[PDB]
């Protein structure tokens, strides 16, 4: 794989959000979107106006500017979605290099990818050494997503679906806390209210 | 989830789609690496994944000369049946295939 | 524990190995712990902890 | 004679080299006292007692 042509014109891309495995954020969105070309128009949540266009390389300035607006669902161009035949377009790759500018027309990127994965291979290990409920960390608002709910005898909202997700929406509108709530959990809250920092939002028996 | 246990990436692609399976692979390998504290950008695994899915199996030949169960690389059938789609003749349908490295 | 225009105060230690550990030059918390304190627990070839 | 790197000590966790260094320093101090006794030749008595 090389940089055969600069562009192909594909509008396909991937959505980027701060990664959360069901606890706190383990890597910010700025680490995952920096140095990549946007894949779509950029708007505030209420379509105030277009902040960034569809082809601006998101370098440090634009990363900070997005940090000001704080929208955290960013469609960005990727290598897999590239329309280029028998090669990769320079825009869908991104800009990363030892140098800070965009990738040059011709650099062999697949070999560099393989070496980049290979260097941490030494730091790994062939054989391993030996090996109740949700506690919110920051202060925010409960947002129940993909969940069926029912009011039990006590009045506490209980969950009747397995795919239940729980988000913490703060006063800006971002999502820093995401959790997966099992079926048959107890929620003293529901979708729409506000909770304190460290306040227990929901409990269930682990077994 | 119709049951539990780890899943096979080929079926993950076959049901959810391309972006889902590449997201799964990059996220899982990022977890494994991040546990040992090695920073690696998602781009390299992106390009590895693009080269992993390069092959795809034809489903319907249509107006093409492909075989009903032939496995050809995505880009080749892409350009061919795309020129036939720009033409009047009906194109050929395919299904993305996941091949190990 | 040191005195400055006064009786006593305390600060981050100037001990050599602690500087080598905190600065990130050479070492981490575990190695310093093992040079000084009781050293954890191992396992038999089966993996069963001692 | 030699200038070693102290940083090589904590990361590699071989403190026995430091004990060997201290004990060799001590033994050489004993030998230097003995050589001083040799040059300022006193007698069999003082050397034997030492």
């Amino acid at each position: 794989l090389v940089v055969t042509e600069d562009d192909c014109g594909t509008h396909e891309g991937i959505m980027m959000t701060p990664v959360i495995e069901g606890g706190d954020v383990k890597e910010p969105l700025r680490d995952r979107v920096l140095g990549r070309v946007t894949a779509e128009d950029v708007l505030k949540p209420g379509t105030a106006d277009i902040l960034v266009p569809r082809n601006t390389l998101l370098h440090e300035q634009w990363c900070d500017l997005l940090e000001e607006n704080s929208v955290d669902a960013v469609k960005v161009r990727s290598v897999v979605s590239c329309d280029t035949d028998f090669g990769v377009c320079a825009h869908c790759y991104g800009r990363d290099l030892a140098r800070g500018h965009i990738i040059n027309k011709g650099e062999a990127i697949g070999v560099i990818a393989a070496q980049s994965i290979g260097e941490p291979g030494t730091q790994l290990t062939m054989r391993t050494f030996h090996i109740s409920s949700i506690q919110v960390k920051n202060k925010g608002s409960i947002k129940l997503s993909n969940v069926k709910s029912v009011v039990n005898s006590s009045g506490k909202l209980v969950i009747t679906s397995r795919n239940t997700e729980l988000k913490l929406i703060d006063e800006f509108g971002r999502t820093k806390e995401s959790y997966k709530v099992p079926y048959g959990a107890v929620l003293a809250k529901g979708d729409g209210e506000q909770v304190a920092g460290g306040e227990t939002v929901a409990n269930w028996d682990p077994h | 989830v119709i049951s539990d246990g780890p899943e096979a990436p080929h079926d993950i692609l076959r049901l959810r789609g391309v972006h889902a399976v590449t997201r799964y692979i990059v996220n899982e390998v990022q977890d494994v690496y991040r546990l040992q504290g090695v920073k690696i950008n998602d781009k390299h695994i992106e390009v590895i994944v693009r080269q992993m899915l390069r092959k795809a199996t034809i489903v319907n030949a249509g107006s093409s000369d492909f075989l009903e169960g032939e496995q050809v690389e995505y880009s080749r059938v892409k350009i061919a049946n795309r020129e036939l789609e720009a033409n009047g003749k009906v194109g050929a349908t395919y299904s993305r295939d996941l091949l190990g490295i | 524990v040191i005195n400055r225009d006064g009786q006593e105060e305390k600060q981050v230690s100037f001990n050599s190995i602690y500087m080598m550990a905190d600065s990130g030059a050479r070492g981490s918390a575990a190695q310093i712990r093992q040079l000084a304190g009781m050293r954890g627990l191992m396992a038999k070839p089966d993996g069963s902890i001692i | 004679d030699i200038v070693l790197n102290p940083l090589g000590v904590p990361s590699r966790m071989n403190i026995g080299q430091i004990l060997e260094t201290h004990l060799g320093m001590a033994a050489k101090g004993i030998g230097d006292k003995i050589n001083a006794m040799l040059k300022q030749q006193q007698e069999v008595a003082k050397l034997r007692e030492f």
């Binding site: 391993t128 090996i131 | - | 050479r26 070492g27 981490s28 954890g40 191992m42 | 990361s11």
Partner: peptide
Amino acid sequence: GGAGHVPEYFVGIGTPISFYG
């Protein structure tokens, strides 16, 4: 401990793992 050149067999479970010199 750190500065990965040999692994640390001795640790409480859950730590990433050294990777010690």
